[PDB]
Design a protein around this ligand. Structure first.
Ligand code: HEM
Length: 196
């Protein structure tokens, strides 16, 4: 009903804010792991003597350099998402305050902001998914080329990679929840002034 629907919309948007925060923090923990993983890869790579193991390591390392970069895009789409969320909150409150006395430019802004934030989430999701498939390949390669020697650190590189995958899977799950919240904010939002 109309007050209850207003509150649901409001509560979805609070839930969404908290989730965006969780996504950003997880993204920073992921970049910390990437940097620490690069150090461990270089350590394995220096000690490697077999040419093929050396090469496999250096090609993982290239991927990881790319993932550092892609973390810049992850971070930014998330940041921009939080910016648009701020603007959703602000335009939202102004809509309730002013109604249709706040002219049509206000209602269009809020709709347009909703449209754009869903695209940023899709962009963010696609970037995360691409990193994750890489890390799944890294594990296969590491399990394949490395042995039980001290210098290989099969355990240390694998452990780090495995912790990373667990976190990137979580990241994608939080993103899918976010996209689902946005859908529901649209579904409730469209109803809010239908018996206003
Ligand atoms: C992530 C946060 C939010 C999203 C994605 C979002 C999205 C939407 C969407 C898609 C609509 C339907 C727009 C249309 O009629 O074409 C809507 C309506 C509305 N939203 Fe939000 N909203 C959010 C947060 C808020 C907040 C915090 C308020 C605060 C009061 C608010 C107030 C409104 C109002 C009053 C309407 C009905 C009038 C209108 O259609 O413009 N919204 N919202």
């Amino acid at each position: 009903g109309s007050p209850e629907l207003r509150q649901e919309h409001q509560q979805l948007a609070q839930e969404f804010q908290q989730l965006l925060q969780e996504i950003q923090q997880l993204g920073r923990e992921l970049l910390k792991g990437e940097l620490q993983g690069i150090k461990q890869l270089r350590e394995a790579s220096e000690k490697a003597r077999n040419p093929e193991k050396k090469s496999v390591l250096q090609k993982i390392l290239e991927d990881e350099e790319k993932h550092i970069e892609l973390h810049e895009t992850l971070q930014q789409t998330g940041q921009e998402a939080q910016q648009l969320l701020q603007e959703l909150q602000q335009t939202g409150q102004e809509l309730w305050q002013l109604g249709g006395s706040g002219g049509p430019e206000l209602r269009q802004k809020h709709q347009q902001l909703a449209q754009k934030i869903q695209q940023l989430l899709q962009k963010h999701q696609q970037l995360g998914a691409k990193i994750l498939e890489d890390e799944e390949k890294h594990i296969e390669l590491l399990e394949t080329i490395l042995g039980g020697s001290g210098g290989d650190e099969l355990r240390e590189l694998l452990k780090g990679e495995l912790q990373g995958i667990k976190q990137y899977r979580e990241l994608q799950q939080l993103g899918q929840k976010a996209q689902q919240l946005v859908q529901k904010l649209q579904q409730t939002g469209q109803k809010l002034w239908q018996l206003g």
